[PDB]
Amino acid sequence: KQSHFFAHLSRLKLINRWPLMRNVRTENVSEHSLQVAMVAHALAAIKNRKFGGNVNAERIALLAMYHDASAVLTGDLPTPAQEYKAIEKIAQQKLVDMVPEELRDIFAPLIDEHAYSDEEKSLVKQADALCAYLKCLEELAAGNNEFLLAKTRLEATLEARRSQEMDYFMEIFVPSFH
Amino acid sequence: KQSHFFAHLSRLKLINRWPLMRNVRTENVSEHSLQVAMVAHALAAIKNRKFGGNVNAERIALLAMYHDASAVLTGDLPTEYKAIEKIAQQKLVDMVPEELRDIFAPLIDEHAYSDEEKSLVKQADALCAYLKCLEELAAGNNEFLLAKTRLEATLEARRSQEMDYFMEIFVPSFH
Numbered sequence: 267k268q269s270h271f272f273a274h275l276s277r278l279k280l281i282n283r284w285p286l287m288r289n290v291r292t293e294n295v296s297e298h299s300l301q302v303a304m305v306a307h308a309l310a311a312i313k314n315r316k317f318g319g320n321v322n323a324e325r326i327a328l329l330a331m332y333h334d335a336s337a338v339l340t341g342d343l344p345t346p347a348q349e350y351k352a353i354e355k356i357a358q359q360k361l362v363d364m365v366p367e368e369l370r371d372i373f374a375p376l377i378d379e380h381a382y383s384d385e386e387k388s389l390v391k392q393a394d395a396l397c398a399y400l401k402c403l404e405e406l407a408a409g410n411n412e413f414l415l416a417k418t419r420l421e422a423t424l425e426a427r428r429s430q431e432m433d434y435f436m437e438i439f440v441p442s443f444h
Numbered sequence: 445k446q447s448h449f450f451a452h453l454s455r456l457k458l459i460n461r462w463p464l465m466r467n468v469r470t471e472n473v474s475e476h477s478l479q480v481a482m483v484a485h486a487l488a489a490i491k492n493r494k495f496g497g498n499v500n501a502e503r504i505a506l507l508a509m510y511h512d513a514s515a516v517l518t519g520d521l522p523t524e525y526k527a528i529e530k531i532a533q534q535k536l537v538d539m540v541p542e543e544l545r546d547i548f549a550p551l552i553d554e555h556a557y558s559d560e561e562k563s564l565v566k567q568a569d570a571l572c573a574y575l576k577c578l579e580e581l582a583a584g585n586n587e588f589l590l591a592k593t594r595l596e597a598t599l600e601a602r603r604s605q606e607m608d609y610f611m612e613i614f615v616p617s618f619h
């Protein structure tokens with residue numbers, strides 16, 4: 267019995283994001299997921315280091331790697347309801363069911379977003395919103411105003427998900443994006 | 445002090461691999477790195493679960509995420525590229541805000557990998573190149589034919605119980 271699990275994960279790089287706008291450069295889910303992982307890990311390490319945190323940052327990188335993994339079954343759906351969130355959970359679950367049985371308990375808590383602690387959830391949602399904001403900033407620096415709307419809207423999401431670790435992040439790493 | 449560190453990591457997606465052949469689909473360092481991290485983690489976890497391992501699979505993910513990070517300063521270097529590499533790493537480390545350097549420096553420079561971790565990340569890197577050959581060969585691109593044959597030799601030299609498990613269980617779905 268062979269497993270199709272990694273065969274499906276290999277198609278992440280095929281799934282394109284932000285379909286409703288002209289993109290100066292088309293982002294795929296695989297590039298996004300690597301950036302969210304790097305960002306969510308950093309947010310966690312900053313939290314731990316500077317803000318009283320006690321979160322497993324390495325664990326948070328791996329959850330970030332897999333946070334949109336079900337896109338390979340569903341496709342990307344641009345965030346602009348309860349039903350969809352439900353479909354995402356079924357897709358996450360079908361992916362889990364592909365993992366060989368003796369391995370399943372390693373991967374379920376990585377793919378199934380029910381398994382995220384409250385803190386792990388906050389950090390990966392903070393990373394995801396930041397990454398989306400960074401995408402907008404790259405596009406606007408490339409002279410593309412189709413992302414102007416989205417930037418402004420993400421500025422609200424980020425204040426909703428505001429933390430000290432995000433504030434540090436925004437102050438220190440974001441201005442080089444402009 | 446703002447830092448250009450993440451500005452530069454975001455450029456991983458720009459650096460293309462396998463530049464000397466025709467590719468049906470061009471692969472970038474960012475795609476590669478996520479994939480090596482997924483495979484390395486899997487290998488680590490397999491070893492632990494089936495083969496008496498005691499390795500930190502999450503640490504191994506994180507290492508693999510950053511294993512080619514300096515490629516943003518140098519470009520893809522097709523296999524003293526080791527000298528160029530060491531300089532780019534250090535440049536990337538100098539960019540990290542000082543107060544956080546101890547966190548990232550080991551990730552970038554790769555000086556503190558255990559032996560096991562080196563083995564697993566390097567098995568993952570070879571496997572990922574080998575998967576890329578199968579994908580290209582599946583799309584009728586024979587330019588990856590030699591490479592596939594060579595990597596079967598890289599994989600044999602780096603052979604492990606966990607690699608064997610991975611090849612038997614997950615890789616047929618790619619051919």
Ligand SMILES: Cc1cn([C@H]2C[C@H](O)[C@@H](COP(=O)(O)O)O2)c(=O)[nH]c1=O
Nearest residue numbers: 283284285342343344345346394398416
């Ligand atoms: C955050 C965000 C994402 N998106 C798009 C990008 C992707 O194509 C898709 C899913 O994004 P996600 O990774 O943030 O959930 O939605 C928007 O269109 N507007 C937004 O504000």
Ligand SMILES: Cc1cn([C@H]2C[C@H](O)[C@@H](COP(=O)(O)O)O2)c(=O)[nH]c1=O
Nearest residue numbers: 461462463520521522523569570573595
């Ligand atoms: C492993 C491997 C990589 N490469 C290429 C792909 C990349 O463009 C570059 C570095 O790859 P690496 O991630 O395996 O160090 O070398 C080969 O041409 N042949 C090989 O066997």
Ligand SMILES: [Co+2]
Nearest residue numbers: 302333334394
């Ligand atoms: Co996402």
Ligand SMILES: [Co+2]
Nearest residue numbers: 480511512569
């Ligand atoms: Co590599």
